[PDB]
């Protein structure tokens, strides 16, 4: 008999060391406790009480080792007796331990082949050779990843009766033979997973890939948490004309032929994803671009009340400019006070008639990008109020708000502007707008307490309080580019860019895997000029030659690499749904939810969900590696080969689930 709390104990020397272990647990939502061990030492928390174990797993980074000088040399800052308490806890309560960034020694059942890893720019490929100890992790065996920049130690298992190999360093320029990279130890009942390589989840995509092995193994696939990867790709500036960067003085506006190519390609890329996936492209519209196109001819202008909204744009304010409330000057023409354009006017745009066709509309996501794309950093309430309401009426008249995938309470702010203009945010709020999207290159717009949370505007910092700013990634597929030559040129001119378009896609592949394998649900920023494909020179992406747009080439690169590494689904959700999950994630993290599991004769038989007062506004996710006896009428989730996720709604009493097949320890 006995019970164990599902809290993960993370032991490290400083907050930087612990972050390479807590970031993964935080991404899953797994409750954890951080114990920092200075060189002077520290005492361990209460590991157990009577018949209840306080921790479901232990993670130790670099053996919390310091150089004590003298003949002592490098030693763990935890005493020998403290390490024995941890080993004793592992045995009595069946708790596993993970150690990464450790040197191969007798404590890990291995010895170093003798030497460091690889210097700067020296690659050594790494791959899992046996994933049978953590099958619900969904890692594809044999797929190679990069160790460049991560110091490691090629190792050799010394006694194969207590230590098995799960990862392997490939041969390279320094080494002629493969070697052991990670092991699992069984020391007379004590189970341990040891990684002979450093971790750096802040910059390394490889580290964010590896962490899913030790997290799944440490928890046996059973934990309070949730593993989902969202792939949301937003296309700004639809119906607008954008000035192209490389062939200066040229302009591009997406065409019907271009869009037919994108439509035909969506099922193609869907069939490349693992089972359970579901991808679509979400579009942000500017209604005034539809009126201006229809008014491009003399007779068309007569059909559109003379044309759309027209004004002179002011010079851009400094970034993060907070407009003093009540100031500014209106730019909108005084004559059109309300959206008053004819349906027949809008129909003169070939691109509109395509978008309004139900078969086309219902294959994409739709959200407002303001009517005229007016920058709102220094705009007035009156201007921004019409920027929102006009585009709402246009979306309603044209029928886009009837789409299967539509966002009604959120916008993509134009060029991410007005987020510090209180009068603008109030104009959003006075219409149905409650959330929006930000820019992850501007730290002011990101949550400073937890990356998994959205930022909430404040009266002090933004002139308005309550607007939810969801994060969004930027890419080297730039907003004013329509060809590979363009993006590569702007990447070269405005960055450390160097190489071809494949070189640009290669760095985008690594950076996006770091986001996706880190369970960052942020969307990605693209623009209408990036969809140009109908008339482009064919290029080759991963050996397949086609008339890919720069947007498609990015998605092809990202999706194929994701599928090469894991078998998880890729699920696209609307901006409205994405903002909802960001809010629910933030809210349930304030309830202090926890899990505990009961053990009966060396086997896990049940779990119990709890929170502060056993109540929470939001349901608590619980991941099952074995199906419980009954989901008890709660909302469940199990796409593709994912484990079963049960959203447990706590209402005052703690909920308990019985494992249909008990998990042996
Ligand atoms: C390799 O590890 C195994 C497992 O720890 C060792 O097997 C133990 O051997 C001792 C003495 O021979 C026995 O008292 C234990 O009962 C054994 N344990 C198990 C689980 O079988 C084995 O001796 C090790 N090999 C070497 C060469 O030391
Ligand atoms: C924000 O808007 C205000 C209001 O239009 C700007 O103030 C005007 O600035 C121009 C400079 O071109 C002056 O000629 C006007 O006299 C100013 N009017 C008032 C009422 O102050 C302000 O410059 C804008 N700031 C930014 C950064 O764009
Ligand atoms: C923790 O469990 C051990 C047995 O493994 C026991 O000896 C010890 O007293 C417990 N700690 C408590 C009750 O504080
Ligand atoms: C519980 O589930 C396992 C497989 O998930 C079975 O092997 C067992 O018999 C029980 O049905
Ligand atoms: Cl037609
Ligand atoms: Cl319809
Ligand atoms: Cl770069
Ligand atoms: Zn835009
Ligand atoms: Zn601008
Ligand atoms: Zn944009
Ligand atoms: Zn990025
Ligand atoms: Zn598969
Ligand atoms: Zn076991």
Numbering used by the authors: 142 to 806
Cite, word for word, the article reporting this structure.
Galactosaminogalactan (GAG), an α-1,4-linked linear exopolysaccharide of galactose (Gal) and N-acetylgalactosamine (GalNAc), is essential for A. fumigatus biofilm formation and a key virulence factor. Lastly, GAG is partially deacetylated by the secreted protein Agd3 and deletion of agd3 abolishes this modification. Herein, we show that A. fumigatus Agd3 has a unique three-domain architecture and that the enzyme specifically deacetylates α-1,4-GalNAc oligosaccharides in a metal-dependent manner. Agd3 has a novel carbohydrate-binding module (CBM) that extends the substrate binding groove, increases activity on soluble GAG, and influences the location of deacetylation within oligosaccharides.
To gain insights into the function of Agd3, structural studies of the predicted globular protein, residues 141–806, were pursued. Agd3 crystallized in the hexagonal space group P 61 2 2. Diffraction data were anisotropic with diffraction limits of 2.6 Å in one dimension and 3 Å in the other two dimensions. The structure was solved by Zn single-wavelength anomalous dispersion and refined to Rwork and Rfree of 19% and 24%, respectively. Agd3 has a unique compact three-domain structure. The N-terminal domain, comprising residues 141–364, adopts a mixed α/β/α-fold (α/β/α-domain) with a seven-stranded β-sheet at its center. The central domain, residues 365–733, contains the CE4 homology region and has a distorted (β/α)7-fold (CE-domain). The C-terminal domain spanning residues 733–806 forms six β-strands in a seven-stranded β-sandwich. The N- and C-terminal domains increase the stability of the CE-domain, as constructs lacking one or both of these accessory domains expressed poorly and could not be purified to homogeneity from either E. coli or Pichia pastoris. Mapping surface conservation reveals a highly conserved electronegative cleft in the CE-domain. IcaB has only 5.2% sequence identity to Agd3 and aligned poorly compared with the other CE4 enzymes with a RMSD of 3.80 Å over 134 α-carbons. The catalytic cations of these CE4 enzymes overlapped with a Zn ion in Agd3, suggesting that Agd3 is also metal dependent.
